[PDB]
Amino acid sequence: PGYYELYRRSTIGNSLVDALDTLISDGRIEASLAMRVLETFDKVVAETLKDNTQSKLTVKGNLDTYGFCDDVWTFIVKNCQVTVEVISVDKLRIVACNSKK
């Protein structure tokens, strides 16, 4: 009964893992508490991206690799144009989960 954990691999999620690990190594918290923070994080990111996101970007390029396993799509787009709100990107890994249960 939880949310996807892919977001822990993002910049903000990875920073949280860092902060969380320093407190564990300092013995300021237990690893279990750290894991519980990470699981709350998963929820919060999913809700924050759903309710406080407005931008709509688009990616155009050559699909170098694709993959679909366990209800997860993975795409490696090379030599593409990412337009936000235009960005040239040599390579871009896209990992996505199902919007449905």
Place this chain on the structure above:
Amino acid sequence: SGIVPTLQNIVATVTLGCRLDLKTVALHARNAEYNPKRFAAVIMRIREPKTTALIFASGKMVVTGAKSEDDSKLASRKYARIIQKIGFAAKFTDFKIQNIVGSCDVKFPIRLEGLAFSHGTFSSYEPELFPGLIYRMVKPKIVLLIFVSGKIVLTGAKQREEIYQAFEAIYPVLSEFRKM
């Protein structure tokens, strides 16, 4: 006739002779998709020759999209080679082409309903369902999809020769119902 149908698709089967963990294949092969909930096989594609393979847990697979007998065997060999490279005792066995599809263009229009009424026992035409006329040829046993445009689809062949013989046989009747 002066025209030679173009082979557009060849379906072949290959027994790799060894059980497979589809979940593992999907994990180590690139361009692979595995969704057992809808199909109990791993779908994998390669670029040369541009084809798509259906790999099963039983170690057997189907290779589709090939445009020549050679590309089909060649593509089949690459898929088997990947399965091996992943870690299975896969072998290239029982290669066999199961279906060849070809298309044509006689260049002229065709009065389909006249062709259907004439060859009622072989053709089924009901634009309501499908715009093309379905001609079920007896010898060779090839199914043709005849369109008003002059475009012809021939399928059901196991030898590329059957597509050719099927087209030669139908050309006279196609010509006979040419809109002119």
